[PDB]
Paper text:
S. aureus bone sialoprotein-binding protein (Bbp) is an allelic variant of SdrE. The gene identified from chromosomal DNA isolated from S. aureus subsp. aureusTCH60 encodes bone sialoprotein-binding protein (Bbp) with 1149 amino acids, containing SD-repeats of 154 residues and the ligand-binding A region from 53 to 601 residues further divided into N1, N2 and N3 domains. S. aureus isolated from patients suffering from septic arthritis and osteomyelitis specifically interacts with bone sialoprotein (BSP), a noncollagenous protein of bone and dentine extracellular matrix, mediated by Bbp. As a bifunctional MSCRAMM, Bbp also recognizes the human Fg α chain and inhibits thrombin induced blood coagulation.
To study the molecular mechanism underlying Bbp-ligand recognition, Bbp273−598 was crystallized in complex with the ligand Fg α561−575. Each crystallographic asymmetric unit contains two independent Bbp273−598-Fg α561−575 molecules. The bound peptide Fg α561−575 threads into the groove between the N2 and N3 domains in a snug conformation, with a well-defined 2Fo-Fc electron density map observed for the residues Lys562–Ser569 of the N-terminus of the peptide. The six residues of the C-terminus of Fg α561−575 have few interactions with the ligand binding groove and are not traceable in the density map. The disordered C-terminus encompassing residues Ser585–Pro598 in apo-Bbp273−598 rearranges in the Bbp273−598-Fg α561−575 structure. The connecting loop between the G′ and G′′ strands spanning residues Thr586-Gly589 runs across the central region of the groove and the following sequence forms a short β-strand G′′ which inserts into N2 domain, making regions BbpAsp338–Gly355 and BbpThr365–Tyr387 deviate significantly from the apo-form. In addition, the binding of the peptide also induces a reorganization of the region BbpAla298–Gly301 between the A and B strands in N2 domain and a large movement of the region BbpSer547–Gln561 between the E′ and F′ strands in N3 domain toward the peptide binding groove. Two newly formed α-helices are observed in both of the two regions. Among them, there are three pairs of antiparallel main-chain hydrogen bonds between residues Fg αSer567, Thr565 and Gln563 and BbpThr582, Leu584 and Thr586 in the G′ strand and the connecting loop region. And then the G′′ strand forms compact interactions with the E strand in the region BbpThr365–Tyr387 of N2 domain, which “Latch” the ligand binding site and thus stabilize the overall structure.
Residue numbers in the entry:
A (entry chain C): 26 to 35
B (entry chain A): 3 to 328
Amino acid sequence: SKQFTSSTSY
Amino acid sequence: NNVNDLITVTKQMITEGIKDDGVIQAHDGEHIIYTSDFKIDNAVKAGDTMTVKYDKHTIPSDITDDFTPVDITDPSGEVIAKGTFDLNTKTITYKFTDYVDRYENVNAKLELNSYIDKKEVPNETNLNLTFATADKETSKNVKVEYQKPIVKDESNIQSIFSHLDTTKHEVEQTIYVNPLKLNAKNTNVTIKSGGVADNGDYYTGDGSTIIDSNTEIKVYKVASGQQLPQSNKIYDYSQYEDVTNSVTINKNYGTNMANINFGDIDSAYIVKVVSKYTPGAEDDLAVQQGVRMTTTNKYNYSSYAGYTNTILSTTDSGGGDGTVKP
Ligand SMILES: [Mg+2]
């Protein structure tokens, strides 16, 4: 399906 | 039945997922895009295999374990090849179906996304990325950059989402509390669904998590001579001191909000939180959780530092076509 990563919210 | 020698690569390239600046912003979730166009010899038959190799420092999914290579399909949905991934060799093996028995002049196009593998890249560094399709390699030099803590007097904190389980609907957050090893007076840390701004201000945001008595919270003390990886991901907790039972944790401090009382500290701590989220929210990128560190500064008021994580996703593609064998 999808592949995922962590990001930062600002 | 490897037929890599029967695969002719006509174009391949490595590009950056967010900005072409030679720097992978890994904590901004910037992915790497590997595109490959190739011809499949007419001698290739059902059950034959080819390989596609990722750079050792990359990984198809950063925070999930469930990666399955995308099928290679023709324009109407016929499957040309099925793929399996070996994490240890960072290699996809594509196995052709009897599509290649029924069609000739077959060609295909792969678009494969990946992220920096934090296990292979604990700290910022320069990398010579090398990808390959059927043993034909291409390379790209990049720098990997990681985030820095928000710092306000002795309040200093940073976090990532370090795992996502879309079956059990759990997300893991790894938090560095006081990574700078400052003398942080009256240290409290809050973990909450939604957002925490750089200055500590709460905001609702565009994602959520569920925090309650069944949230898992572990706390580890870092020694003065211990160095934390800039990747913000801890693969082995055994060399740190588990102090979960020596700090005060209230998982029900507020609505979807936990807090931890550290008191006066002079050391860094790692906090690992496993919380739940709304089933399906990952498809809307609606998983978001933030942290706030509070300390008392030398002027007798509070200083705040905040940090918020969310998720990003990518989807690989594999297409091909051919003409009918008479
Ligand atoms: Mg970039």
